[PDB]
Structure formats: C-alpha cells, structure tokens
C-alpha cells in the first residue's frame with residue numbers, strides 16, 4: 134500500500150483486527166531503524182511508561198519532549214523526567230489564551246536515515262490500549278551526502294512545510310531538528326502537511342495553517358467534479374469546542390466552506406459529524422472511563438444543541454473497532470454513495486475554532502490558539518482522480534484507501550445523546566459493572 138496509514142493495536146479484538154495494526158513498541162523497534170535520537174511531540178506524557186516502550190538498548194538515547202504545559206503542570210512533567218538524564222524538554226509557547234499543544238508527532242533519527250510519525254495518541258498506556266487511534270508512517274528518509282546540493286523536497290512540499298511548522302515554535306531544541314531535516318531527502322513523501330500553530334495570520338500567512346491551509350491545498354491540488362454539491366463532508370473527532378449559537382456562526386460558514394473546496398473555480402453539501410454517543414461509550418471495551426478522553430463539557434454543549442442533529446454514532450465494524458472508542462480525528466470527502474473519496478485527512482485537530490482557526494478583523498485575519506498536526510491524502514499525489522474506499526480495513530488492488538470506520542455514518546437515534554464527560558450516567562452500568570459519577 135502507498136498510504137502507510139495504520140491503526141494502533143487494540144487489546145481484546147480478534148487477531149485478524151490487529152494484523153497490520155501498530156503498537157508503539159512496533160514503531161520504536163530496531164526493525165524500523167537504529168535509533169540515535171528522538172523527539173516526542175505530544176500533549177500528555179507518562180515518562181516512565183514512555184521510556185519502557187523504547188527497546189532496552191535505545192532507552193538512553195536522547196529524547197526531547199515537546200509539550201505545552203505551564204506552572205504546576207510544567208513542574209510535574211519536569212519532575213517526571215528528572216530521573217532520566219537523557220530526556221530534554223521543550224515548552225511550546227502558548228501566547229494566546231486557552232491554547233493547547235495537541236500535535237502528536239515522533240521525529241526518529243537513525244543511523245540509517247530519518248523517520249517522521251504523525252499520529253493521534255497521547256504517550257500514556259490507555260491511549261494505546263483499547264482506543265481507535267491513527268498513525269501515518271513516513272518512508273525511511275536517507276541522508277543527503279555531505280557536499281551534495283539537492284533540495285530533498287517532495288512534490289507535496291512536505292520538507293519545507295515541516296520545517297516551517299517547526300520554525301513557528303522559535304525553540305532552540307527544535308532548530309536542531311530543523312537542521313537534521315535539512316540534511317535528509319524527503320522527496321518520496323506523498324502526503325501534504327496540515328498544521329495549526331498559535332497566532333493571528335493575515336495576508337501572505339493566512340493560507341499557512343488551519344482550515345485555510347486545507348482550503349488552499351484543495352483549491353490547488355484537487356479537481357472539482359460534476360455534482361460536487363452531492364459529495365458529503367465527513368468529520369470525525371473526540372471533542373467539540375464552542376461553535377456559536379447556530380451553524381452560520383462558524384461551522385457552516387467558514388469551516389464547512391473550507392472543507393467543501395475543490396479546484397480553482399468559484400451550500401446543500403451534506404455534513405456528517407461522527408462523535409461517540411453515551412451508549413457507544415457505555416458498551417465500549419473501556420466502559421465509561423473511555424469518556425475521560427472525550428472531553429465535551431455540558432457547559433459547552435447546552436449552548437449549541439443545534440449541533441447535535443449533525444451527530445452520527447461511532448461504528449467501525451470494518452476494522453473490528455466499534456467498541457474501541459475513537460481518539461483518532463479524521464476528515465474526508467466521500468462520493469454520494471460513499472464508494473470513493475476525494476481526499477482523506479488524519480489529524481490531531483478536533484471540531485473546534487481553537488484547532489482550526491476562526492476569522493477575525495472583518496475576515497482578514499485567521500486566529501488559531503493551538504498546535505495541531507495532520508497529513509492530507511490527495512488522489513493527485515498518487516496519480517489518481519479519486520480513492521476507492523477499502524471495503525474491509527484489514528482485507529486485501531492496493532490503490533484503495535483504508536477508511537477505518539463504517540460508511541455511510543449512522544445518525545443518532547432519538548434516544549441517543551452525545552457523550553458529555555462531566556455529567557453523571559447512573560441509568561445503566563458499563564462493561565465493567567460501573568456507573569459514571571464525575
């Protein structure tokens with residue numbers, strides 16, 4: 134397969150549903166490369182657990198943790214890391230209020246080359262145990278010979294774009310990794326980088342990040358088709374921000390507008406949002422504790438009941454993962470019969486203005502609060518007009534894209550409710566025999 138898109142291993146499904154899945158121990162294995170140094174970009178870390186996932190022979194190689202923690206949280210993380218003299222830390226600046234460092238990425242420097250891993254899991258045991266999570270694995274990028282002058286750039290501009298993303302941190306530890314990337318040949322990369330960084334972007338910078346970045350890529354590198362207004366948009370996420378008093382405030386005015394872009398020319402496009410119901414969580418492998426990683430608060434939700442008519446259940450029979458709650462985030466553009474897709478994005482970005490950006494100053498400025506990162510699969514980058522949807526995620530021509538959940542998405546039933554993490558559920562017990570009392 135050309136896509137190199139994987140799910141994490143799920144404990145408790147039959148082996149047929151983990152053949153081709155990856156655990157973090159698989160990613161860090163010597164079989165992937167002889168580790169010299171690594172950077173772990175993430176949100177939450179269990180440092181003791183994390184070091185154990187590296188092969189024993191590699192556990193003293195340098196590790197950089199890139200995080201966004203402040204004040205006591207920052208102290209707690211440093212205290213976690215203090216016992217390991219090989220671990221350095223980089224605090225990503227979050228100069229806009231309510232921002233988060235959500236990006237989940239491994240930079241893996243080997244004897245043999247460099248690998249980039251963009252994924253959706255926190256570096257804690259529970260995020261790799263029984264959740265649905267996504268991974269993109271880059272090729273092994275060879276080093277450019279010293280004295281040789283070549284760009285090492287791909288047709289998707291991934292090398293420059295990754296360096297640009299790292300430069301936004303303004304961090305000395307990441308300038309070191311920028312210099313590493315400069316020295317490697319990333320020309321085989323067939324995905325486009327879509328990042329968010331905190332800031333207020335106007336003019337020549339508005340298209341660099343967030344949903345304007347997606348819009349720019351779709352305008353430049355996808356083609357519109359006849360009956361494009363019939364191709365739905367699907368968004369799939371593990372949390373929702375405050376979107377406004379109605380759909381015209383942000384969801385359907387600028388977010389949907391960016392996602393329905395195709396091609397360079399000048400809406401009733403169906404929008405499907407996939408988000409676990411209470412029943413999805415209750416009957417999940419984890420039970421109600423899965424809802425600790427689906428942090429939709431009642432304060433947010435009661436301000437936007439209009440949103441929930443868009444919500445569809447989590448269902449993933451195709452990957453045996455209907456009971457493995459999603460912490461992956463994905464966005465895609467299926468055909469009206471869901472048999473093809475015009476593009477697929479896997480990312481850290483949830484359904485929120487903080488993650489995707491919101492227009493300010495009379496539409497001239499895109500304001501983003503958070504760090505996010507994902508990769509975009511476009512048919513043109515593979516010599517194709519569209520992707521055929523793989524019918525069974527783990528089944529057997531390799532030019533079909535492995536969508537990890539079921540299509541078409543299934544609307545919430547009248548008795549379903551979106552999972553809301555900070556109210557109690559005491560009506561029916563979960564798969565472990567417990568209720569939810571936050």
Ligand SMILES: O=C(O)c1cccc(O)c1C(=O)O
Nearest residue numbers: 176235255371372426428483
């Ligand atoms: O895991 C994360 O990066 C995260 C952190 C804080 C709130 C969240 O909603 C999420 C998420 O849903 O991914």
